[PDB]
UniProtKB/Swiss-Prot annotation, chain A:
Pathway: Amino-acid biosynthesis; L-tryptophan biosynthesis; L-tryptophan from chorismate: step 5/5. One of its GO terms (molecular function) is tryptophan synthase activity. InterPro entries: Trp_synth_b_CS (IPR006653), Trp_synth_beta (IPR006654), Trp_synth_beta/beta-like (IPR023026), TrpB-like_PALP (IPR001926), TrpB-like_PALP_sf (IPR036052). It catalyses: (1S,2R)-1-C-(indol-3-yl)glycerol 3-phosphate + L-serine = D-glyceraldehyde 3-phosphate + L-tryptophan + H2O. Its EC number is 4.2.1.20. This is Tryptophan synthase beta chain. Its cofactor is pyridoxal 5'-phosphate. GO terms for cellular component: cytoplasm. The gene is trpB. Tetramer of two alpha and two beta chains. The beta subunit is responsible for the synthesis of L-tryptophan from indole and L-serine. It comes from Thermus thermophilus (strain ATCC BAA-163 / DSM 7039 / HB27). It comes from the Bacteria. Keywords: Amino-acid biosynthesis, Aromatic amino acid biosynthesis, Lyase, Pyridoxal phosphate, Tryptophan biosynthesis. The modification N6-(pyridoxal phosphate)lysine is found at residue 94.
Amino acid sequence: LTLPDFPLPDARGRFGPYGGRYVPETLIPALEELEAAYREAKKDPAFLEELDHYLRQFAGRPTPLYHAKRLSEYWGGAQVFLKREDLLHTGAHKINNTLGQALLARRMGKRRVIAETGAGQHGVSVATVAALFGLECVVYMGEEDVRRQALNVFRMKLLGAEVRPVAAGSRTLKDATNEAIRDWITNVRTTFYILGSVVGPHPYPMMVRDFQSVIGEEVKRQSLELFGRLPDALIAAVGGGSNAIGLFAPFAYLPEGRPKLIGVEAAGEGLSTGRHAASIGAGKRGVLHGSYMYLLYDYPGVGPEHSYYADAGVAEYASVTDEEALEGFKLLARLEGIIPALESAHAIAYAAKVVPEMDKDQVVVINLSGRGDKDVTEVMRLLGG
Amino acid sequence: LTLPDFPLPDARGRFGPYGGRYVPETLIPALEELEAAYREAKKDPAFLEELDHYLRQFAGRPTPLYHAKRLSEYWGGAQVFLKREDLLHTGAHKINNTLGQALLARRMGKRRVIAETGAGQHGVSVATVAALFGLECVVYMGEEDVRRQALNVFRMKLLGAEVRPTLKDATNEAIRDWITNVRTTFYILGSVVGPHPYPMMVRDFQSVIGEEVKRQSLELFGRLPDALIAAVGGGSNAIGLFAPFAYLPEGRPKLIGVEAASVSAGLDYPGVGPEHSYYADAGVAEYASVTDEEALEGFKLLARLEGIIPALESAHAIAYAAKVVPEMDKDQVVVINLSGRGDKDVTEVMRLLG
Ligand SMILES: [Cl-]
């Protein structure tokens, strides 16, 4: 493992005009303590060696770059390869970042890690990692969410995490984030706040990317050892997560002929494209979670680095309808025997619109962020065939 | 990346006095052909190549031999390593076997593959490798199981397979179908208690686990483990880990199989199967059991200390290791097999625990 040193973000956490840390003076000291501790850690071979050991032994890295022969033939276009992040522990790509942040918590001396969770996957990713290192864990979760996520709540309790219900406001992720951040600020000396999103204040965006970058670097290597060259295009779902960021960053900052990068977002309800693309075309920008970025003032935003990618021209952003995503979901399962997370099914849907036109000798990599076993019931709610 | 050529069973499928099964006259010709095809397949490099390719790129092999540090410190005894079979695609170790069998069926020119399942784990495994190889898949499930397993039924359906309705009523309905359409159908069985050559075949495809542990132990310890522990029951988990060690001239690790706390349909059979029975007699493996309450405690112990939620089945072995690892020395090594992940039994364990 080698943590990158990309030309961006800059010292202030800026990717061009995007990024930064537009936060209250109460958060500042905590964030600068973190940034400093992270800058040090990424250089230390002791940290790198340890991180690498856990990614391999615990998370199960590196993940295979799987050739979907049936998919390739079905589309009749370029050869399609799947980066199997679904074969990770917890079942999500999230763990690369959670493992990295928890390890930095231990290295900083913190004995406690907190985070917030909506659906519950993050909460489980954090609870899981805290168990590995033996850290006290508290996950803030809106009450609404706590009732429609009994399973994941039980898992967190099994992992030994304390799930702290949030009744405030509308009892959702939004509220949980406030209770959490406040906790972290008060208990900064002993606690670390684990954020898995690429949309947030510096150095979170840079840190999440760096930890997720192990995805693209593996693709870069696996490709060179497989085709003697890099892919023609990389396709991944985008939406305030981190999945695409890890795949993209190792190629975004490369010279002229890097592979084409395609971020696929969910069609904005009442729109023809996603919020990001829509913001790019309209030129509307704003601040979100102390991060300047494209904002159409699913997620309200996709992040500063993705905003930079758009203007730098290293990545284009497309969208697909809810129906096209379900079509992608059913497709992969039927042809490859792999049930992908709904997020990834979106990437599959878009690849359907561009892979067929490409040459049969070209290579395309699609990122499978996680497994769909979590989304099976939601997809089956619309029970049919 | 070749297949194993173990001394047992013999040409007839017997492990000492074990193996003999009562197979109706109309099934004998299908089992003989299966033997012929299989014996011929393991001789072909191209066959071994595809198996390995898929085992690696699709299933995710090799699985890590993980050092459970917090749990080795807790028991205070020997070092504990967990063979992470829970990282495999689908979450179960049984996929080593289904991938191999669906591959055999394709080589044999079959275009259809059938199977039967209770809770649905086997149905999904089969359906998965059926979609992977473009084979037609039909899973026989009982009316009851089908209602209590809405998820798996849907999964199977998404994988493109057809689910047609107690599992007892589904097994002998499938054997019939197999016989009638044997010319075009292959029957995937994930059990080590059926008639020859299934126990040998399943053992061979599962062997990959044990062989991996053998080389992983050698590279990390320079020697083989002191004891290997695995739950013996639903599936072929313990056999895959055991076989590559059970026939070693010596320097053999102690093999400890762990067991759980009427009517025989189709090709099912009571017991642990021919090979585990032979191991016991020959004395190359010893067996034990734990109470439901003890395994339940293991489930929770591994979740809290290692961040790994095991299958209730693996929790039985965990529980058993709890009774022997602490006595041992901190310089000794113990490998525990984690057959699958417990993200399924977690709903059940959630009930009987308030
Ligand atoms: Cl992203």
